[PDB]
Amino acid sequence: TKKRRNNGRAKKGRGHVQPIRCTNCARCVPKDKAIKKFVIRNIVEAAAVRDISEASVFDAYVLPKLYVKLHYCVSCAIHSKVVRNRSREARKDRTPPPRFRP
Amino acid sequence: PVGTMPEGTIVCCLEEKPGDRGKLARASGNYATVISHNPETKKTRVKLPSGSKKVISSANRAVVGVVAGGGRIDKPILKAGRAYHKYKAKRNCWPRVRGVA
Amino acid sequence: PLAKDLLHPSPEEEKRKHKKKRLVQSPNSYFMDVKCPGCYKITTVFSHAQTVVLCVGCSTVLCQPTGGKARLTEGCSFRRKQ
Amino acid sequence: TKKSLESINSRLQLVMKSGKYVLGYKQTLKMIRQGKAKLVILANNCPALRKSEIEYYAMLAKTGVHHYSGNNIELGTACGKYYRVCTLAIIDPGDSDIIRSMP
Amino acid sequence: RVQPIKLARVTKVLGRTGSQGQCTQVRVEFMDDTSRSIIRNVKGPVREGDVLTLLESEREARRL
Amino acid sequence: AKRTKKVGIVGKYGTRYGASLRKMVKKIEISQHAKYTCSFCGKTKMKRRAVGIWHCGSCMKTVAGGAWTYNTTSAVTVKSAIRRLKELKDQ
Amino acid sequence: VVDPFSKKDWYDVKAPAMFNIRNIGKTLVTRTQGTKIASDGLKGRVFEVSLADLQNDEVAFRKFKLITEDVQGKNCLTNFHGMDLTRDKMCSMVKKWQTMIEAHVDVKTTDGYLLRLFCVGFTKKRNNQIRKTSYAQHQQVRQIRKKMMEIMTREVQTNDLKEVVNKLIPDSIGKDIEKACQSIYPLHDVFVRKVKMLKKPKFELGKLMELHGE
Amino acid sequence: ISLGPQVAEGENVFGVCHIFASFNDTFVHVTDLSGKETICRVTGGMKVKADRDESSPYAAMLAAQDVAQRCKELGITALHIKLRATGGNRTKTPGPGAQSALRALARSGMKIGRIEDVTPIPSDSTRRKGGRRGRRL
RNA sequence: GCGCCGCUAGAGGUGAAAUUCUUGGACCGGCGCAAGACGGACCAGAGCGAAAGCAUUUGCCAAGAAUGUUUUCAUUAAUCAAGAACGAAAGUCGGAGGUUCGAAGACGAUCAGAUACCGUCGUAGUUCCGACCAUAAACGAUGCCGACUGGCGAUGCGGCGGC
Ligand SMILES: [Mg+2]
Ligand SMILES: [Zn+2]
Ligand SMILES: [Zn+2]
């Protein structure tokens, strides 16, 4: 049976997209099947914030962030639990999950 | 001189000692690349056409480029008569009997 | 909309369609009169013009051809005719 | 190498269709020593002492020399014909502005 | 190298952990200021608000 | 006419020397026997003299070229990088 | 058995006179034992220093390079080598749904200091803009990029290296290509991304000692 | 008194410290301001005898202890941080011995200046050692 | 990869480890140079192309759709046996090149066994030019041309009108 209307991929008006390679297992995936995740992790590991700002040579130092783009094959996106298997009618929404930062 | 041309240049007919008037990479199609100048204790290294890197003088005089006549070993001799004329002009070595026979 | 009286449309609905696809087809072009500043010569240049039209005596540039409808060069006196 | 070398060889074929000119070495040599040649064009292929004296009479006739970046078989097709021509002189351009270009 | 074996009072207990229900995350405070507070884990039962003594004070928390 | 269908220039060797060896020769052979366009006069008169030696029927100019073709691609790759190293850094 | 840090000594590294703070730091080098003298061992040392510990207020995401070209006893005098941005700034400003344009040009000064200038720029989302993609078109990209490299080809070929590196402590070049391109498409993160060094003019000793004067 | 710089009480000297925190190991190499003269390189794999724990954060913790207890022992007193991942062809996130090597360098008496991630990011080059279906554990 | 410096005994790689690299000083840090590949992030249910496919900047050359058109010719059209053109990757022949990766093969492991997964190395191959082969889950698993038959927001390219 055809499972999904797009074929798991966001290509419509093309014939071919670039292959990129998975981050953890280095598997060859197209650029628009690959599960992207952009990580804006602060480099300081927030438990270790009030141990370096007192050891700083300033009084208010802007701690640099780290900006690493991840992208995954879906055999390693499901195993690492960055995406989850969903029900057959909760599948037709492209909205992302909420943030819940504080 | 090889001490003045920059690195990665393509060189034929270079002296292996200063004054030798050209000994290395003289056959057809051959060339040598310069790499790694050393301005103190003036001596450069080159890359011989056998893949051997060899240190030479800085003042070994040498002609820029590759030797004319390259690709000569891409055509087969293809019959015994054209190997006869090939070595008739060089030496007396061509009909080589196997030592087993 | 089962009962659109599609033989007598409003001219508001007639204006905002294609120049084909109308109940009776008709162009969006017109002819326009242009007074170049400094002569008697009204020119009768076409609206969606394609050539660089020049004036007869005061032979500066009159209009410029562009994408659909011709960019007039000078802010000059102007009226749509017929 | 992409858009606009149709300033040189497309204004040159416009003179070819409209204006008047001579092709060849010794025809331009006649035209440049009696002044009637307005602009001479030399090909990249032309021999170095032939180039050196066509420039030298245009120093004397006070006319322009253009060095067409291209072969003499390339300048012949840029004329629009099946010759090879190193040197030409246009002696009456039609209405284009090869003279009133860059030189 | 040589650390004082530093004691610490606990704020809110962060529930069980340790894959068998054996370890409790506790978030201690270091008895000298309430600004300095690391999250750590003990085994055995806790009673929120008591005092426990770290043999070495700062190693790691539970995160992958 | 289409007097042969595959061998071409190496039909002169006949049934001899192999199938791949004759196919190897007919590339080199149509290249050393060709008339090449002269870069110096424009006339397609570059005929090969001895191996490595290329000469004009008209303007009479002798060029040191390749063994079987006028430009060895190893040699033209050199000339592209020599003039690069000449203008870059200026020795 | 022997300690290699007893045969060494600490010099100190100076900035050119156009910066406010002049004393960069303290490198170290071994002492002379025969061949290895203590003046070729530290020429060509690159000191990657930012503006914020080299000016009184200026930003931290912009660093310079400062090759060593002379030793004057304990002093270790430097000259400009290049600049680039920090990478956290460099990829904070690369966001989706905007066209990034970049240009590069090889311009030498009037002082004989052939440089290669790297500039970026990002198209700007407006203040009432409702549509998501603030993309430029490709011919708008090409005429911005021609406008970017034309302006910096001016203001480096104007005069010597000294006023050129002094031009991009505040980065008035990025302000200049900002104001002169926003009647084509508005741009909002427009920096000279990197300056790379290609030539050195013979090392006149008088020119460097001009740079460590008043 | 051949060891030590010429500093007063209040002034501090800077050197950069490279945290190459990959998997399988971690490097807490510290050097001068030019990066050319090594002051103290010690490695988390040189202070464990386990070979699982070369890339532990506890190895990077006490390697950062030793490199700070030698740095301050010399006379260099404050450090720039130049944290790396493997980068280039491999992964571009740092390993487990990044944050522990940074915090142990701050708890054990050392001052910290400009910090920056300096890992190699390519402009799309150099096909990666996995094959096409990757590695299949 | 190779030079020249700096400091030190490990570095690498794994679920573990080993084969392996290393005080003729490896990895690491710096400055350089060379070479061959490849164009990241921007990069999207965006664009172009007949399909395969196409992403660094400027620049010779030829093409093209859509739109605009009160221009032109006046059925010149549709689909198409035969017969052609192009067609991923792998593959073949020949020459350049050979960084990375890597069939085959060698070894180290793991295993009852491992001719597999995993690791170290590595041939052909992967890159370019020329000549071939003409096949793919060449898939939207939907031939092309034509018309009619709901709604709504958005997008890409033109054109028109307005605070
Ligand atoms: Mg024999
Ligand atoms: Zn994966
Ligand atoms: Zn000739």
Short mmCIF file of N, CA, C and O in Angstrom, two decimals, chain H residues 63-134:
data_model
loop_
_atom_site.label_atom_id
_atom_site.label_comp_id
_atom_site.label_asym_id
_atom_site.label_seq_id
_atom_site.Cartn_x
_atom_site.Cartn_y
_atom_site.Cartn_z
N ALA H 63 42.94 15.30 34.10
CA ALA H 63 43.93 15.82 33.17
C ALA H 63 43.93 17.34 33.18
O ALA H 63 44.99 17.97 33.06
N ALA H 64 42.76 17.95 33.32
CA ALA H 64 42.69 19.40 33.42
C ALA H 64 43.21 19.88 34.77
O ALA H 64 43.66 21.03 34.87
N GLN H 65 43.13 19.05 35.80
CA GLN H 65 43.78 19.35 37.07
C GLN H 65 45.29 19.43 36.90
O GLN H 65 45.92 20.39 37.34
N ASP H 66 45.87 18.42 36.24
CA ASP H 66 47.32 18.35 36.10
C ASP H 66 47.86 19.44 35.20
O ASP H 66 48.96 19.96 35.43
N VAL H 67 47.11 19.81 34.17
CA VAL H 67 47.61 20.84 33.27
C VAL H 67 47.49 22.21 33.91
O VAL H 67 48.25 23.12 33.57
N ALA H 68 46.59 22.39 34.87
CA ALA H 68 46.48 23.65 35.58
C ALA H 68 47.44 23.72 36.75
O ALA H 68 47.89 24.81 37.13
N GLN H 69 47.77 22.57 37.34
CA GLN H 69 48.74 22.47 38.42
C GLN H 69 50.18 22.48 37.90
O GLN H 69 51.12 22.53 38.70
N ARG H 70 50.36 22.47 36.59
CA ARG H 70 51.65 22.74 35.96
C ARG H 70 51.74 24.13 35.37
O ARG H 70 52.80 24.76 35.42
N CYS H 71 50.62 24.62 34.81
CA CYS H 71 50.55 25.96 34.24
C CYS H 71 50.80 27.03 35.29
O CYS H 71 51.67 27.89 35.13
N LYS H 72 50.05 26.97 36.39
CA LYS H 72 50.25 27.88 37.51
C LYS H 72 51.60 27.65 38.18
O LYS H 72 52.19 28.59 38.73
N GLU H 73 52.11 26.42 38.13
CA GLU H 73 53.43 26.13 38.67
C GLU H 73 54.53 26.81 37.87
O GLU H 73 55.59 27.14 38.42
N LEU H 74 54.30 27.05 36.58
CA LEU H 74 55.28 27.77 35.78
C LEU H 74 55.20 29.27 36.03
O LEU H 74 56.19 29.90 36.41
N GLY H 75 54.02 29.85 35.87
CA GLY H 75 53.85 31.28 36.04
C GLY H 75 52.82 31.87 35.10
O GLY H 75 52.40 33.02 35.27
N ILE H 76 52.41 31.09 34.11
CA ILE H 76 51.26 31.43 33.29
C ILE H 76 49.98 31.20 34.08
O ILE H 76 49.80 30.14 34.70
N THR H 77 49.08 32.20 34.07
CA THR H 77 48.00 32.29 35.05
C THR H 77 46.58 32.39 34.50
O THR H 77 45.64 32.30 35.29
N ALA H 78 46.39 32.59 33.20
CA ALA H 78 45.04 32.73 32.68
C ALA H 78 44.98 32.24 31.24
O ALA H 78 45.94 32.40 30.49
N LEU H 79 43.85 31.64 30.87
CA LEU H 79 43.78 30.81 29.67
C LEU H 79 42.64 31.19 28.74
O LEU H 79 41.50 31.36 29.18
N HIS H 80 42.96 31.32 27.46
CA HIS H 80 41.96 31.27 26.40
C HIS H 80 41.64 29.82 26.05
O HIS H 80 42.51 28.95 26.06
N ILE H 81 40.38 29.57 25.72
CA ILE H 81 39.90 28.22 25.44
C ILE H 81 39.62 28.10 23.95
O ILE H 81 38.96 28.96 23.37
N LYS H 82 40.13 27.03 23.34
CA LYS H 82 40.01 26.80 21.91
C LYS H 82 39.51 25.37 21.68
O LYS H 82 40.17 24.54 21.05
N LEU H 83 38.37 25.08 22.31
CA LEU H 83 37.69 23.79 22.22
C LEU H 83 37.46 23.32 20.79
O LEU H 83 37.08 24.10 19.91
N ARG H 84 37.71 22.03 20.56
CA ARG H 84 37.51 21.38 19.28
C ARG H 84 36.58 20.19 19.40
O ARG H 84 36.41 19.59 20.46
N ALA H 85 35.98 19.86 18.27
CA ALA H 85 35.46 18.54 17.99
C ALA H 85 36.46 17.85 17.08
O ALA H 85 37.56 18.35 16.84
N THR H 86 36.08 16.69 16.55
CA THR H 86 36.90 16.09 15.51
C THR H 86 36.83 16.92 14.24
O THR H 86 37.86 17.27 13.65
N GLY H 87 35.62 17.25 13.81
CA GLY H 87 35.40 18.15 12.71
C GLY H 87 35.80 17.55 11.38
O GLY H 87 36.09 16.37 11.25
N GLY H 88 35.83 18.43 10.37
CA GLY H 88 36.26 18.05 9.05
C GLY H 88 35.33 17.05 8.41
O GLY H 88 34.21 17.37 8.00
N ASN H 89 35.79 15.81 8.34
CA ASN H 89 35.00 14.77 7.72
C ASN H 89 34.06 14.10 8.72
O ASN H 89 32.92 13.78 8.38
N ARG H 90 34.53 13.92 9.95
CA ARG H 90 33.79 13.26 11.02
C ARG H 90 32.77 14.18 11.67
O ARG H 90 32.38 15.20 11.10
N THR H 91 32.31 13.79 12.86
CA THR H 91 31.34 14.56 13.62
C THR H 91 31.89 15.92 14.02
O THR H 91 33.10 16.14 14.09
N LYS H 92 30.98 16.86 14.25
CA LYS H 92 31.35 18.24 14.54
C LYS H 92 30.85 18.71 15.90
O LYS H 92 30.92 19.90 16.19
N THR H 93 30.35 17.80 16.73
CA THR H 93 30.05 18.08 18.13
C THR H 93 31.16 17.55 19.03
O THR H 93 31.76 16.51 18.73
N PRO H 94 31.51 18.26 20.10
CA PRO H 94 32.61 17.80 20.95
C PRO H 94 32.20 16.63 21.82
O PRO H 94 31.01 16.35 22.02
N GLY H 95 33.21 15.94 22.35
CA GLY H 95 33.00 14.71 23.07
C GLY H 95 32.68 14.93 24.53
O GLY H 95 32.41 16.05 24.97
N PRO H 96 32.69 13.85 25.31
CA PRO H 96 32.31 13.96 26.73
C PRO H 96 33.32 14.71 27.57
O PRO H 96 32.93 15.32 28.57
N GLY H 97 34.59 14.70 27.21
CA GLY H 97 35.59 15.38 28.00
C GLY H 97 35.84 16.82 27.60
O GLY H 97 36.98 17.29 27.61
N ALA H 98 34.78 17.53 27.24
CA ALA H 98 34.84 18.95 26.92
C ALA H 98 34.49 19.79 28.14
O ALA H 98 35.26 20.66 28.55
N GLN H 99 33.32 19.55 28.71
CA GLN H 99 32.82 20.40 29.78
C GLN H 99 33.52 20.09 31.09
O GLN H 99 33.74 21.00 31.91
N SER H 100 33.88 18.83 31.32
CA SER H 100 34.62 18.49 32.53
C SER H 100 36.04 19.01 32.47
O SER H 100 36.59 19.40 33.51
N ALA H 101 36.65 19.05 31.29
CA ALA H 101 37.98 19.62 31.16
C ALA H 101 37.97 21.13 31.28
O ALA H 101 39.00 21.73 31.61
N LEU H 102 36.83 21.76 31.04
CA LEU H 102 36.69 23.20 31.17
C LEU H 102 36.37 23.60 32.60
O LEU H 102 36.92 24.59 33.11
N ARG H 103 35.49 22.85 33.27
CA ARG H 103 35.09 23.22 34.62
C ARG H 103 36.17 22.87 35.64
O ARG H 103 36.40 23.62 36.59
N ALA H 104 36.86 21.74 35.45
CA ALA H 104 37.99 21.41 36.33
C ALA H 104 39.14 22.37 36.14
O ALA H 104 39.94 22.57 37.07
N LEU H 105 39.25 22.98 34.96
CA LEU H 105 40.23 24.02 34.72
C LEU H 105 39.84 25.34 35.38
O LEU H 105 40.70 26.20 35.58
N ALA H 106 38.57 25.49 35.76
CA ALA H 106 38.09 26.68 36.45
C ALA H 106 38.00 26.50 37.95
O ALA H 106 38.24 27.45 38.70
N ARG H 107 37.65 25.30 38.42
CA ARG H 107 37.60 25.07 39.86
C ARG H 107 38.99 24.99 40.46
O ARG H 107 39.19 25.40 41.61
N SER H 108 39.96 24.46 39.73
CA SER H 108 41.32 24.30 40.24
C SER H 108 42.20 25.48 39.89
O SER H 108 43.30 25.32 39.38
N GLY H 109 41.72 26.69 40.17
CA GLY H 109 42.55 27.88 40.19
C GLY H 109 43.16 28.34 38.88
O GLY H 109 44.39 28.27 38.72
N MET H 110 42.35 28.81 37.95
CA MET H 110 42.87 29.38 36.71
C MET H 110 41.82 30.35 36.17
O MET H 110 40.62 30.09 36.29
N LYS H 111 42.28 31.45 35.59
CA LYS H 111 41.37 32.45 35.04
C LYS H 111 41.14 32.20 33.56
O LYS H 111 41.97 31.61 32.87
N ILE H 112 39.98 32.65 33.08
CA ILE H 112 39.49 32.26 31.76
C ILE H 112 39.12 33.50 30.98
O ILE H 112 38.34 34.33 31.45
N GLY H 113 39.68 33.63 29.77
CA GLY H 113 39.42 34.75 28.90
C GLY H 113 38.45 34.42 27.78
O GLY H 113 37.38 33.87 28.03
N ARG H 114 38.82 34.76 26.55
CA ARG H 114 37.96 34.49 25.40
C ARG H 114 37.93 33.00 25.11
O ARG H 114 38.98 32.35 25.07
N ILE H 115 36.74 32.45 24.93
CA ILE H 115 36.57 31.04 24.61
C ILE H 115 35.89 30.97 23.25
O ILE H 115 35.07 31.83 22.91
N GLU H 116 36.25 29.97 22.45
CA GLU H 116 35.75 29.85 21.09
C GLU H 116 35.91 28.42 20.60
O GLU H 116 36.95 27.80 20.84
N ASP H 117 34.90 27.93 19.90
CA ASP H 117 34.95 26.63 19.24
C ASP H 117 35.63 26.78 17.87
O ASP H 117 35.21 27.60 17.05
N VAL H 118 36.65 25.96 17.64
CA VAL H 118 37.58 26.21 16.54
C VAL H 118 37.74 24.94 15.70
O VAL H 118 38.73 24.76 14.98
N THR H 119 36.74 24.07 15.75
CA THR H 119 36.82 22.79 15.05
C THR H 119 36.78 22.99 13.53
O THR H 119 36.23 23.98 13.03
N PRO H 120 37.44 22.11 12.77
CA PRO H 120 37.44 22.23 11.31
C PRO H 120 36.11 21.92 10.64
O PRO H 120 35.62 20.79 10.72
N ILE H 121 35.51 22.89 9.97
CA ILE H 121 34.31 22.70 9.16
C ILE H 121 34.69 22.88 7.70
O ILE H 121 35.21 23.95 7.33
N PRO H 122 34.48 21.89 6.84
CA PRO H 122 34.85 22.02 5.44
C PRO H 122 33.75 22.66 4.60
O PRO H 122 32.58 22.69 4.97
N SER H 123 34.17 23.16 3.44
CA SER H 123 33.24 23.61 2.42
C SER H 123 32.83 22.47 1.49
O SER H 123 33.04 22.54 0.28
N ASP H 124 32.27 21.41 2.09
CA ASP H 124 31.83 20.18 1.44
C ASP H 124 32.95 19.46 0.72
O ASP H 124 33.09 19.60 -0.49
N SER H 125 33.81 18.75 1.45
CA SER H 125 34.86 18.00 0.79
C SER H 125 34.97 16.61 1.40
O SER H 125 34.33 16.32 2.41
N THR H 126 35.75 15.76 0.72
CA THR H 126 36.39 14.59 1.33
C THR H 126 35.41 13.53 1.83
O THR H 126 35.00 13.59 2.99
N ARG H 127 34.93 12.69 0.91
CA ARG H 127 33.98 11.60 1.19
C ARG H 127 34.34 10.79 2.43
O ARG H 127 35.50 10.48 2.69
N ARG H 128 33.31 10.45 3.21
CA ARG H 128 33.46 10.00 4.59
C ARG H 128 33.60 8.49 4.66
O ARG H 128 32.98 7.76 3.88
N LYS H 129 34.40 8.02 5.61
CA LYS H 129 34.68 6.59 5.81
C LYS H 129 33.47 5.94 6.47
O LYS H 129 33.38 5.79 7.69
N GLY H 130 32.46 5.63 5.66
CA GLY H 130 31.45 4.71 6.14
C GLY H 130 30.93 3.70 5.14
O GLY H 130 30.32 2.70 5.54
N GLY H 131 31.18 3.91 3.87
CA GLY H 131 30.41 3.24 2.84
C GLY H 131 29.16 4.02 2.51
O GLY H 131 29.04 5.22 2.79
N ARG H 132 28.19 3.33 1.91
CA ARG H 132 26.94 3.96 1.50
C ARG H 132 25.79 3.64 2.43
O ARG H 132 24.96 4.52 2.70
N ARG H 133 25.74 2.44 2.97
CA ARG H 133 24.78 2.10 3.99
C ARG H 133 25.30 2.39 5.39
O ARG H 133 24.66 1.99 6.37
N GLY H 134 26.43 3.07 5.50
CA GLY H 134 26.95 3.44 6.79
C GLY H 134 27.61 2.27 7.48
O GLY H 134 27.97 1.27 6.86
#
